Amino acid sequence: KDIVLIQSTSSLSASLGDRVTISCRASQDIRNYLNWYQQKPDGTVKLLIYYTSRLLPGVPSRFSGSGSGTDYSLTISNLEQEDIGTYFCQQGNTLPWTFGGGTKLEIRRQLQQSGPELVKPGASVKISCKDSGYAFSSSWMNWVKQRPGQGPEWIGRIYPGDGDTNYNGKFKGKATLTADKSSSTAYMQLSSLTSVDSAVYFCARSGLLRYAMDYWGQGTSVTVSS
Numbered sequence: 001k002d003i004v005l006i007q008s009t010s011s012l013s014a015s016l017g018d019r020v021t022i023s024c025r026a027s028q029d030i031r032n033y034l035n036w037y038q039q040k041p042d043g044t045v046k047l048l049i050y051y052t053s054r055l056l057p058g059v060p061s062r063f064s065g066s067g068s069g070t071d072y073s074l075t076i077s078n079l080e081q082e083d084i085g086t087y088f089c090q091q092g093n094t095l096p097w098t099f100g101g102g103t104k105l106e107i108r109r110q111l112q113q114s115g116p117e118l119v120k121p122g123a124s125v126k127i128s129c130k131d132s133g134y135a136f137s138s139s140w141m142n143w144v145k146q147r148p149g150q151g152p153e154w155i156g157r158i159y160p161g162d163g164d165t166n167y168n169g170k171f172k173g174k175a176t177l178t179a180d181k182s183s184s185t186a187y188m189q190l191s192s193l194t195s196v197d198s199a200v201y202f203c204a205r206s207g208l209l210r211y212a213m214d215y216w217g218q219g220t221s222v223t224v225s226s
Contacts, residue, residue: 002168003027003091005151007100013108020076022103024089029069033092035212036065036074037152039102040085043219045202049074050212081107088151092211096168097142097154111203111217118223119193126189127220129203133184137161139207141179141186145171146219147199157206158186193224 004027014020024034036049047056052072053065062077076083084107089100110132117125129141143155156167160179167175174197179186186203200221204213 001027002096002098003030003094005089005091005098005100007087007089007103007151009103010101011104011106013106014079015108016079016081018079020079020083020105022074022087022105024067024072024074024100026070026072026091026093028093030091030093032068033211034065034067034072035090035092037088037090037213038083038085039088043200045204045216045219047212047214047216050209050214056214079105079107090152090154090211092209095166096156096170097211099151099153101151111205111215113203113217113220116221116223118225120225121194122192123224124189124191124193125222126187127201127222129186129188129217131184131186131205131215133205133215135205135207136179136184136186137181139205140210141177142204142206142213143175143177143188144202144204144213145199146202147196152202155188155201160186190222193222195224198222198224 006025032052034052039045049065064075086102086104088102112130114128137160140157142157145153155171158165158177176189200219202219203217205215206213
């Protein structure tokens with residue numbers, strides 16, 4: 001079994017200025033390889049904390065991370081408006097990378113992806129991700145699935161340099177990852193689509209830390225019609 005990540009609280013509201021603390025739990029000691037992403041109401045994703053407690057450039061100091069072994073947490077010392085969205089943890093100890101179920105936080109009382117697609121059941125789609133950055137061929141391009149309400153799912157990755165890939169077993173016969181160095185574009189084809197495939201798919205890069213995706217595409221929504 002892949003390491004399961006749990007975020008016991010899936011919905012929490014609070015007032016501005018409030019101290020907010022979100023818990024993440026792993027089914028096995030993930031040796032401090034734990035990250036936290038923020039997804040704003042518009043669906044965009046961002047890596048906030050990596051390796052349990054390291055803030056990424058530009059994150060506000062009101063964010064911190066704690067924990068070890070199997071128990072981790074994210075804390076916002078005083079909630080701000082821009083802090084609204086959903087928070088997902090993710091383990092980077094063993095492939096496939098797995099994410100928690102997300103915690104939607106509310107207030108009480110370079111990666112350029114292709115457009116949305118609508119398809120009939122059983123049809124296939126090939127979507128793209130153009131990276132304007134200089135590390136396209138020297139980084140890993142990861143892909144993530146997000147069904148409305150569920151936690152993201154790491155589908156697999158590809159190293160544009162030599163075309164090597166690493167898939168999540170669940171999507172092996174489902175996804176085919178390819179890239180193009182001359183155009184700095186990573187492609188993902190999803191075959192024989194079912195209603196279970198309707199979702200938003202993200203491309204996200206990693207390089208310095210293969211388990212933490214620090215740059216994300218805006219996401220492409222694929223809908224498998226009735």
